[PDB]
Design a protein around this ligand. Structure first.
Ligand code: MG
Ligand code: MG
Lengths: 211, 211
């Protein structure tokens, strides 16, 4: 399995998210409704994306902090495979979300932990023990040793790690030799002259490095 | 100023949130679109609530973790006065959100920090220095000394503190002598036989204790 290419749809309206998704959909592995977009338009976007892409992985990036079973159910019934919980969510909250998405989506339903602020590696092990083994790591605000070592360490622990922030066809090589699960890209690709060509070039660079 | 009564609308659909809001609106001080509801229906709810309640305080509970300026702008243009950021949001994120909501809503625009997981008092002081002085404290999963002391301490620091979780007309007295800014109630009130009567009894108990 090569690293996945994920497109983040972080648009402030429905037409922007749908247009971007359709423009790049055939060239990516994972299509994500980003939190900015969901807060604007609600979960019907998820259902529209599922209908357009029956076999693709679909992410509802809700960054759930509470009401885990409810939010997870609301998005799984729309067709999501993966849902994010914010790292400050409690273990009971994340477990409720995991159980609800697995209940509706036994084949692919998973929670991903969104990594923000001062999280710890003991916390991270608690996520693993809760049955949750995906985490989303963000570039500090290019990909220095401090960030890559945290990524490598999360990988050693047993996480499938997604990385996001400052990703381009040109910076992918910085991750050579690291077993990154998914690279999340956004406007770098969807705002390109040729979005599908940009998505393709990006995945072709993943092929060159990991293939 | 007495402690405010805030109703949380945490419904999984638009009709539930609107019906609950209308049922209790005249009896409460603050009407909140809860995160569960916003993830379902999007920010048009905020605009509907603003139109129904022109002079009321309106909360968009987005628990923003990132894209602070964008999310804050998206909800302020709909009419929100207060927006929540999750405590794991960075200081640059919270400052971007604060600046954007103040930009559209100079009279009442504020950020509130939603308190989840292992936050610290140094973090809390960083929020104050960032110009943010509201925090939402949740009952641990009735109102023992450990929780009340954290509340009292946040108040001593300079925060207007909202409390939520396990609030009833019967438990309000547990907070006697503490300068709570807002009590957030939810289904205890909106699911009552007489929602407006329940909202009224709750506020009447606030009057009795703080009046
Ligand atoms: Mg995302
Ligand atoms: Mg809330």
């Amino acid at each position: 399995q090569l690293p996945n290419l994920q497109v983040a749809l972080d648009h402030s309206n429905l037409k922007g998210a749908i247009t971007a998704a359709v423009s790049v959909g055939n060239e990516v592995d994972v299509i994500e409704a980003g939190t900015v977009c969901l807060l604007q338009v609600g979960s019907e976007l998820v259902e529209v994306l599922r209908s357009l892409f029956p076999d693709k992985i679909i992410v509802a990036d809700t960054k759930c902090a509470d009401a885990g079973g409810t939010v997870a159910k609301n998005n799984a019934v729309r067709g999501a495979d993966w849902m994010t919980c914010i790292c400050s969510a409690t273990i009971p909250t994340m477990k409720a979300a995991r159980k609800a998405i697995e209940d509706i989506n036994p084949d692919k339903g998973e929670i991903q932990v969104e990594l923000y602020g001062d999280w710890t590696y003991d916390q991270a092990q608690q996520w693993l023990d809760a049955g949750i083994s995906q985490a989303i790591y963000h570039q500090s605000r290019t990909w220095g040793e401090k960030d890559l070592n945290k990524v490598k360490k999360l990988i050693e622990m047993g996480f499938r790690v997604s990385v996001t922030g400052g990703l381009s066809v040109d910076t992918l090589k910085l991750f050579e030799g690291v077993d990154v699960f998914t690279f999340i890209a956004g406007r770098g690709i969807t705002e390109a002259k040729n979005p599908a060509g940009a998505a393709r070039a990006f995945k072709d660079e993943i092929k060159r490095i990991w293939g």
